[PDB]
Design an enzyme around this catalytic site. Structure first.
Site, PDB file in Angstrom:
ATOM      1  N   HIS A  41       6.098 -40.671  11.194  1.00  0.00           N
ATOM      2  CA  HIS A  41       7.205 -40.555  12.143  1.00  0.00           C
ATOM      3  C   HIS A  41       6.746 -40.246  13.590  1.00  0.00           C
ATOM      4  O   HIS A  41       7.576 -40.223  14.499  1.00  0.00           O
ATOM      5  CB  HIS A  41       8.289 -39.606  11.650  1.00  0.00           C
ATOM      6  CG  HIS A  41       7.941 -38.164  11.723  1.00  0.00           C
ATOM      7  ND1 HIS A  41       7.588 -37.461  10.591  1.00  0.00           N
ATOM      8  CD2 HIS A  41       8.016 -37.307  12.766  1.00  0.00           C
ATOM      9  CE1 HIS A  41       7.397 -36.213  10.989  1.00  0.00           C
ATOM     10  NE2 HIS A  41       7.642 -36.072  12.287  1.00  0.00           N
ATOM     11  N   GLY A 143       7.096 -29.749  16.929  1.00  0.00           N
ATOM     12  CA  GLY A 143       5.710 -30.007  17.282  1.00  0.00           C
ATOM     13  C   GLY A 143       4.724 -29.632  16.181  1.00  0.00           C
ATOM     14  O   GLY A 143       3.543 -30.010  16.254  1.00  0.00           O
ATOM     15  N   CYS A 145       4.681 -30.746  13.093  1.00  0.00           N
ATOM     16  CA  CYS A 145       4.393 -31.829  12.163  1.00  0.00           C
ATOM     17  C   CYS A 145       2.939 -32.254  12.209  1.00  0.00           C
ATOM     18  O   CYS A 145       2.302 -32.182  13.254  1.00  0.00           O
ATOM     19  CB  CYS A 145       5.347 -32.997  12.356  1.00  0.00           C
ATOM     20  SG  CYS A 145       7.081 -32.501  12.311  1.00  0.00           S
TER      21      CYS A 145
END
Ligand SMILES: Nc1cncc2c1CCCN2C(=O)Cc1cccc(Cl)c1
Ligand SMILES: Nc1cncc2c1CCCN2C(=O)Cc1cccc(Cl)c1
Lengths: 304, 304
Positions: A41, A143, A145
């Site tokens: 993503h 942030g 991820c």
């Protein structure tokens, strides 16, 4: 003496953290050898997350659209591919700090350390468990991820988790390092509910053994039980069923303390039925389930 | 979202851990620049610990009697001195992995991360607080002496603790990096009792603010109180007195949540008087006091 929620030393993993930016999205990547692993993503905008077709969105991206920064220096992306929910970015430079590593898919109940990162930089390390509903109760902000979960056996880092998502309830979901989500979660901005978060019984028992080893013994009772009788109680309290496989794994703890596994189950049964009555065990007023029998042995023996 | 007992990433400190052996005693050392810092009781045998005269025992030791091993390679000791309860071993090689560092003496209530080590090798990392009785509740086994406590501000490691001793109650005592013990403890095998372990009120309040930020709000009441009224209750429950200095430090948390500090004190007062009634806050059935207001801001903002 003393018993703490202890994480693995994070150094080996810190040396692998990079920042990955694609368009206006920035998250963390894991650089091992000449490959950078990150959540797919990273290619999405917030609007794309509503109903993303990753294969379609990825057609609009080339190697030069993935900006990989390790410290303050830029890595050259020479290839890219999608494996399940992760992107693998081939870079022209092998990570000189790559430790010995494996990718493992853990079972629910298993614990691991998380190195929470932002912009490719480590912020902190904590220990958690893969819940029986395949969520983790982490501490992750926007942030985070791409931050990873891992275990270490002497010099080998076994990477088991990569953070992808926060559910509307504030619990976390992610994948193994092959990009397969734990549980039924999908990388989409759609409401996904988690199942029952049951208590990891074998871990509670391991932690009761740790408490006896460290001197907290008030909860030891004069009773014993059977697996079937204990499991009737476990079911009633949303505890995972205890099997002979779990009894087998508690054997070293039973041997060290001289407390038979089924006697410890009877102590746990009474704690479930009577509560703690305002008392604490290892500084906790509730039964802790994020220490595996292996973690208890490791902490109580000093494995490095 | 989510709130965890988080430690600083340990990499920078892992690069400083060495093994120090003198005679038949082995413990951990901290190698910074060309100096190795370790507990002075490395020169003692078990018999010496009963009533050690460190200055006398040190006369029988020369540079070559201190064996310093960094990884699998031996460091050459070219000087040695005792500073309070620590030995400083000058080596001929500066640690190439020396991070930017400071030595700080912390106040009770302050938190730090511990990199527990055995034989110069890191076993785990955990977060703890300097208790108001100047003990720490760590997780330390034989061989853990010399393991250090630290905080990190961006790239600077502030070393605040070096482990020396386990009290007969299983709580821990140690020194700052200048070798001065926290509290009245002495490095001797003599029974030393710790004082009252009071609860760090400002930290409980910071953690109640963290709970509100993360959605746990059931405990918020319709009341307010004053510092003097709250402190009468705090005294009764063995909580540290709250001062205007503590109120000042909770200001950013009060601003973020819109809950006045004194309103949060009134919520805490009711929790002390009524208990949790079987409920939990941030996954805990007791009031947590090992998160400072700075830790809550840091974790809730994602400082790296
Ligand atoms: N606080 C926090 C923690 N962990 C992740 C996220 C947040 C807040 C915003 C970013 N984020 C996401 O979950 C973004 C996202 C949306 C939909 C699907 C997927 Cl795979 C990811
Ligand atoms: N389990 C554990 C944890 N932390 C330290 C120690 C243990 C067990 C044995 C070693 N040890 C000590 O405290 C030895 C010691 C004795 C007297 C004075 C001093 Cl400065 C040190």
């Amino acid at each position: 003496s003393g018993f703490r929620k202890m994480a693995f030393p994070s150094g080996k993993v810190e040396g692998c953290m990079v920042q990955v930016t694609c368009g206006t999205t920035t998250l963390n990547g894991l650089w091992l050898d000449d490959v950078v692993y990150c959540p797919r993503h990273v290619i999405c905008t917030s609007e794309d997350m509503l109903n993303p077709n990753y294969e379609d969105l990825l057609i609009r991206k080339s190697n030069h659209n993935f900006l990989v920064q390790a410290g303050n220096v830029q890595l050259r992306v020479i290839g890219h591919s999608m494996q399940n929910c992760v992107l693998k970015l081939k870079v022209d430079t092998a990570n000189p700090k790559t430790p010995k590593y494996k990718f493992v898919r853990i079972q629910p109940g298993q614990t691991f350390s998380v190195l929470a990162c932002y912009n490719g930089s480590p912020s902190g390390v904590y220990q958690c468990a893969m819940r029986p509903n395949f969520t983790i109760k982490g501490s992750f902000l926007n942030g985070s991820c791409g931050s990873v979960g891992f275990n270490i056996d002497y010099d080998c880092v076994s990477f088991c988790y990569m953070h992808h998502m926060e559910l509307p309830t504030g619990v976390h979901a992610g994948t193994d390092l092959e990009g397969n989500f734990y549980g039924p979660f999908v990388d989409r901005q759609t409401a996904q509910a988690a199942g029952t978060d049951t208590t990891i019984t074998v871990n509670v028992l391991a932690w009761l053994y740790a408490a006896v080893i460290n001197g907290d013994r008030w909860f030891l009772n004069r009773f014993t039980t059977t697996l079937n009788d204990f499991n009737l109680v476990a079911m009633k309290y949303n505890y995972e069923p205890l099997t002979q496989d779990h009894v087998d794994i508690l054997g070293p703890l039973s041997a060290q303390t001289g407390i038979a596994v089924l006697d410890m189950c009877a102590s746990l049964k009474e704690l479930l039925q009577n509560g703690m009555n305002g008392r604490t065990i290892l500084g906790s007023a509730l039964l802790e389930d994020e220490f595996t029998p292996f973690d208890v042995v490791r902490q109580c023996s000093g494995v490095t």
